């Protein structure tokens, strides 16, 4: 057994497969930061830090002795617990195809939104710097009319061309802004296709953890997600009616390049 | 070239070998912590932290989300710069065997004493916990008479037997206490041989960075020195008369077991 | 060692690779003349001239003796010096991925803009004739409305068809004009795509060293860039805090055909 105590859960193999499939499917559709960030692959639960390669002066009074200390970013562990009824678990073996996995879907939505909220807006209680507050480019204001949003995106593209950052540009929209863009037309054809012709092999991302919008280069050396443990399901507890489980991820995140993104502020 | 800019120093190969030999020889005789601590070998300049395997609660307000952060110890870099005259360097090629390497000897003494001072007494400006302030055993008082020091060492051995720690025991003495023990007899034979019969395949260490004395088990799982870069000579600067160099080490240190050492207080 | 004194710079290999990558990446995105001009490849630092194949009468008073002198264009050397802090250089070996290379980016922008300014507008202090002042076609005036710029480009295309120059036509825009064209629509679709349908396998170039715009044939025998030394990084000087470096290029440039370009004047 490992720290996920999976062999102690009263859950047969095919019920495990269904819980896993709902977790993976819901998590993947709600993660947006992984599509724009270099993802150093999962290196295990035991890894704890990624260095920034910077040092810091340490106070010393010994004559002729200089002390530095390295600076790292310690990995955060995210955990979302969820409770599953044992009747759905047991009904999998009777041939049910409609067992209630809505708690695992809610947990996968919560952990995906927490991961994108750490990557995009930072987590200051742990010293994670997000892409949006670390951007050195000023925020281009989102207009209240959706017919001017393509002009705001072209202004952000001219900002990124002006500061010397060229690559494929992805545009991450918040759920409200993605909704406004998906439910609007300008000359008979939708505003999402007004946006997708400006990008040119960059994509338009629904980012439900974002607030406004974010234009970002997928140049490929600017943001680093250091995944320790990828999305894993663990066991916590059970009684006669329910099994208590959790989802878990460990990672560090480093936003190296400040200039390669333009926030679109609400 | 690497971060030690050795190929830019105006120092021929055989002068480099003499500086290296004086540095290694002086450093090894003055290090005492490496003889009692498990030394995980040099893993390079790039390593920056060793995990403690402990986590810490991070403040979060998202419903159903728990955030932890790993806890590591960031490596410290020690640097001792020293200046060598170019006349000694150049005289090596004329066949001199008495070139002045006293600055490198002073630098090696300083960096060895800084390393043992970090291991034994801690470095609180960097969060290194030393063996002596981390000891859970109370301090056995060193008597002012050197004829009672063997009784203090036997009392410390009974402390270590009482708390259930048995292995070969090493006894690290400060330079003043090592001097008092080496310059004293009790029944015609020296007090260092009164001490060495109590230890029984443990050794008596001269530890010039210590203040009083320290009895410690070499059981072999209690203290971990995580060497990043071992003792290296780097180049800094030169003028027509002198070359400015430095010695460098990077390491983390973890004192796992609090109970396996008894301080002997002055 | 060669005239770039690279082996004397206190810069390790991987820091050199990062400086090189930033220099190449910034230089390539800011050069526009190399995309329209035949580039005779780099022949080395030692080459000094390219002939124009024309001669000139020399004054002689000897009876029955005619003296001519060949006419060449001497290569120019461009040098942009930049200073890099040694802390960024040294942090590369500690695993930093955010070392400050903004000085090399500013230097690469400056040397790319100087090269395009020599190719496009000439360098009269060295006798380089640019494409724009050497054009025998009159300037088609850029309208102040961006909705008429496609009509100005069609007028310039009819000029080039009228003087008998047909090939793929590229359109080089200044940064202001490229910005106005990228941030504008005419019937729901951008003005850059109004321009790109007139060209027909010719491209639309952002040329930040240009003033107005320039339509030009890539017929393929009209303009010759004779590269002596391609973009190279050299070492100049260093102190304890910074290394002084430079970027360098050597080239001659010949604009053979006057008729194959139409300037679009501001």
The data reach a resolution, in angstroms, of 2.3
CB of A221 within 8 Å of any CB in chain C? yes
Please tell me whether residues C38 and C18 are part of one structural domain.
yes
Give C249→chain B minimum CA distance, Å.
26
Is C97 within 8 Å of A256 when comparing Cβ atoms? Answer: yes
Query: What pairing do the DSSP bridges indicate for beta strands B66-74 and B49-58?
Result: antiparallel
Please tell me whether residues C154 and C69 are part of one structural domain.
no
Please tell me what DSSP assigns to residue B226: E
Give C232→chain B minimum CA distance, Å.
20
Is B65 within 8 Å of A79 when comparing Cβ atoms? Answer: yes
Please tell me whether residues C20 and C140 are part of one structural domain.
no
Query: What distance in Å separates the CA atoms of residue A55 and residue A213, rounded to the nearest whole number?
Result: 34
Q: What is the CA radius of gyration of chain A?
A: 22
Please tell me whether residues A29 and A104 are part of one structural domain.
yes
Contact B48, C95 (CB under 8 A): yes
CB of C10 within 8 Å of any CB in chain B? yes
Give A35→chain B minimum CA distance, Å.
23
Contact A225, A51 (CB under 8 A): no
Please tell me whether residues C138 and C102 are part of one structural domain.
no
Query: CA A168, A174, A175, A181: dihedral to nearest 10 degrees?
Result: -60
List Cβ neighbours of B148 (8 Å cut-off, separation of 6 or more): none
Q: How many other CB atoms are there within 10 angstroms of residue A130's CB atom?
A: 20
The residue whose two tokens read 């020296």 is B190
In this complex, the residue of B49, B55, B114 whose CB is nearest that of residue A72 is B49
Structural domain span for residue C189: 132-217+256-266
Please tell me whether residues C163 and C38 are part of one structural domain.
no
Please tell me whether residues A260 and A248 are part of one structural domain.
no
Instruction: Look at residues C82, C65, C36 and name the one whose alpha carbon lies nearest to residue C213.
Output: C36
Please tell me whether residues B123 and B233 are part of one structural domain.
yes
Phi, psi for C46 (deg, rounded to 5) = -75, -20
Please tell me whether residues B86 and B6 are part of one structural domain.
yes
Which residues of chain C make contact with A151, given a CB cutoff of 8 A?
183
Reduced to 3 states, what is the DSSP secondary structure of residue B26? helix
- The DSSP annotation for A137-179 comes to SPPEEPPSSGGGHHHHHHHHHHHHHHTT--S-EEEEE-HHHHH
Instruction: Look at residues C26, C38, C86 and name the one whose alpha carbon lies nearest to residue C256.
Output: C38
The residue whose two tokens read 């004329």 is B94
Query: What distance in Å separates the CA atoms of residue B177 and residue B186, rounded to the nearest whole number?
Result: 16
E-assigned strand segments in chain B: 38-40, 49-58, 66-74, 76-85, 140-141, 169-173, 204-206, 213-217, 223-238, 242-255, 261-265
Beta bridge partners of A249: A78
Is B5 within 8 Å of C8 when comparing Cβ atoms? Answer: no
The residue whose two tokens read 């009164």 is B194
- Domain count of the fold of chain A: 2
Reduced to 3 states, what is the DSSP secondary structure of residue C234? strand
Query: What distance in Å separates the CA atoms of residue C218 and residue C215, rounded to the nearest whole number?
Result: 10
Please tell me whether residues A127 and A141 are part of one structural domain.
no
Instruction: Look at residues C129, C156, C150, C138 and name the one whose alpha carbon lies nearest to residue C254.
Output: C129
Please tell me whether residues A119 and A196 are part of one structural domain.
no
Query: What distance in Å separates the CA atoms of residue B236 and residue C10, rounded to the nearest whole number?
Result: 10
Cα A187 to the chain's mean position, in Å?
Answer: 34
In this complex, the residue of B58, B74, B126 whose CB is nearest that of residue A126 is B58
Structure tokens at C2: 């060669």
- Closest residue in chain A to residue B48, using alpha carbons only: A70
CB of B16 within 8 Å of any CB in chain C? no
The vertex-C63 CA angle with C59 and C65, nearest 5°, equals 60
Q: What is the CA radius of gyration of chain C?
A: 22
Instruction: Look at residues A32, A266, A259, A36 and name the one whose alpha carbon lies nearest to residue A149.
Output: A266
What's the distance, Cα to Cα, between the start and end of chain C in Å? 48
The vertex-A38 CA angle with A247 and A250, nearest 5°, equals 25
Experimental method: cryo-EM
Phi, psi for B17 (deg, rounded to 5) = -65, -35
Burial of B118 per CB tally in 10 Å (0-12, 13-18, 19+)? buried
With b for 16 or more beta-carbon neighbours within 10 A and e for fewer, the A180-211 pattern comes to bbeeeebeeeebbebbbebbeebebbbbbbbb
Contact C111, C81 (CB under 8 A): no
The residue whose two tokens read 């000139």 is C56
Which residues of chain C make contact with A51, given a CB cutoff of 8 A?
94-96
Structure tokens at C251: 């080239």
Please tell me whether residues C5 and C52 are part of one structural domain.
yes
The sign of the dihedral angle between the CA atoms of A225, A228, A233, A239 is: negative
Instruction: Look at residues B258, B162, B177 and name the one whose alpha carbon lies nearest to residue B216.
Output: B258
Give C217→chain B minimum CA distance, Å.
48
The vertex-B14 CA angle with B10 and B20, nearest 5°, equals 85
With b for 16 or more beta-carbon neighbours within 10 A and e for fewer, the A99-114 pattern comes to bebebbbebbbbbbbb
With b for 16 or more beta-carbon neighbours within 10 A and e for fewer, the B132-151 pattern comes to bebbebebbebeeebeebbe
Q: How many other CB atoms are there within 10 angstroms of residue C71's CB atom?
A: 12
Phi, psi for B52 (deg, rounded to 5) = -90, -5
Burial of C58 per CB tally in 10 Å (0-12, 13-18, 19+)? exposed
Name all chains with 3 or more CB-CB pairs below 8 Å to chain A. B, C
Is A76 within 8 Å of B66 when comparing Cβ atoms? Answer: no
């Amino acid at each position: 057994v490992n720290n996920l105590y999976r062999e102690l859960a009263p859950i047969p193999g095919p019920a495990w497969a269904e819980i896993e499939e709902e977790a993976r499917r819901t998590f993947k559709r709600n993660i947006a930061g992984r599509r724009i960030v270099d993802v150093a692959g999962p290196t295990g639960f035991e890894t704890s830090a990624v260095t920034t390669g910077h040092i810091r002066d340490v106070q010393s009074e010994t004559s002729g002795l200089q002390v530095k200390q390295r600076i790292v970013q310690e990995y955060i562990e995210l955990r979302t617990p969820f409770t599953v009824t044992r009747q759905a678990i047991d009904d999998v073996a009777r041939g049910s195809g409609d067992s209630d996995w809505q708690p695992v879907k809610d947990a996968a939505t919560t952990i995906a939104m927490a991961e994108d909220r750490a990557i995009l807006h930072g987590l200051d209680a742990a010293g994670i710097g997000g892409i949006v507050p670390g951007s050195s480019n000023a925020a281009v204001a989102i207009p209240d009319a959706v017919e001017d949003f393509a002009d705001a995106v072209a202004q952000a593209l001219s900002v990124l061309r002006t500061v010397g950052v060229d690559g494929p540009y992805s545009l991450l929209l918040s759920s409200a802004e993605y909704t406004k863009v998906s439910e609007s037309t300008d000359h008979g054809y939708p505003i999402r296709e007004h946006l997708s012709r400006q990008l040119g092999a960059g994509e338009i991302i629904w980012a439900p953890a974002l607030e406004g919008a974010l234009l970002v280069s997928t140049r490929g050396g600017d943001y680093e997600l250091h995944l320790g443990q990828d999305l894993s399901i663990g066991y916590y507890s059970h009684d006669s009616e329910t099994v208590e489980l959790y989802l878990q991820e460990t990672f560090g995140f480093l936003a190296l390049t400040d200039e390669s993104s333009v926030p679109l502020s609400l």
